[PDB]
């Protein structure tokens, strides 16, 4: 299947160079897959969600996004024009206020939860969490995430936007996690973005358009915009049977396009997400 005029970010990961525009993917669209989106919610009433984003879960008095920050990432993972992998089913768990804030007990359990709640969904392709979210080190939120994974949950995780080496903010730190850093659109890595030995990939991070609240849609720039392509490919490729969530960041590395972005520190890893989607 071919998308013609995508979001830059789309037709980077189908793509072996920047600078084109279509975004090219098997028609199966991570069809039988689930992705958790921990978040501020998810907007499932917008039109882009097409009936398959439902609110499974808050901590707060309501389960709206009322910040719009999870509804773009789950748009990224899976709306109709701005996701990766766009016949997935989107669940969303609410752990940040509608000012993007959340306690780390509240992330914990919210982590907890998707890992019993995924034997309560039908996702015979397999199950993804994306956590555009983190703060300071952490053993228990480090852990709590090493946890779903362990569950059989592939656990996709924000690097951070600090500029600054990943090692000293969670779930980041986590070994065991897929920990995404962010690229432009010039294969730049993100000027914002985290670096260092546990980051695992690099995903497309700025200028990111993808769904927002009150039906609309929205141009913005994070760590938390990588994630959701990275968890979007994860759901996509494990309905195509190419991988499992214990081996899917593995395989995701494996298949990359290497060595093609800049500015990326010694040490940290050269890989750009790419479906390799030959149509």
Request: proline share 3%; aromatic share 8%; glycine share 12%.
């Amino acid at each position: 299947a071919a998308q013609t005029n995508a979001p830059w970010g789309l037709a980077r990961i189908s793509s072996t160079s920047p600078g084109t525009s279509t975004y090219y993917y098997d028609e199966s669209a991570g069809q039988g897959s689930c992705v958790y989106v921990i978040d501020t919610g998810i907007e499932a009433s917008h039109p882009e969600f097409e009936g398959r984003a439902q609110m499974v879960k808050t901590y707060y008095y309501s389960s709206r996004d009322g910040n719009g920050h999870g509804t773009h990432c789950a748009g990224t993972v899976g709306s109709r024009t701005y996701g990766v992998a766009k016949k997935t089913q989107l669940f969303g768990v609410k752990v940040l206020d509608d000012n993007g804030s959340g306690q780390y007990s509240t992330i914990i359990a919210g982590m907890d939860f998707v890992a019993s709640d995924k034997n309560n969904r039908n996702c015979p392709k397999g199950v993804v969490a994306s956590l555009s979210l983190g703060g300071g080190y952490s053993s228990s939120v480090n852990s709590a995430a090493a946890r779903l994974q362990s569950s059989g949950v592939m656990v996709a995780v924000a690097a951070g936007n600090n500029n600054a080496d990943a090692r000293n903010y969670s779930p980041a730190s986590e070994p065991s996690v897929c920990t995404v850093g962010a690229s432009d659109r010039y294969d730049r890595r993100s000027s914002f973005s985290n670096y260092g030995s546990v980051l695992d990939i690099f995903g497309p991070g700025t200028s990111i358009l993808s769904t927002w609240i009150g039906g609309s849609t929205r141009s913005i720039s994070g760590t938390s915009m990588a994630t959701p392509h990275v968890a979007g490919l994860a759901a996509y490729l494990m309905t195509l049977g190419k991988t499992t969530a214990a081996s899917a960041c593995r395989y995701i590395a494996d298949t990359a396009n290497k060595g093609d972005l800049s500015n990326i520190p010694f040490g940290t890893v050269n890989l750009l997400a790419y479906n390799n989607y030959q149509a």
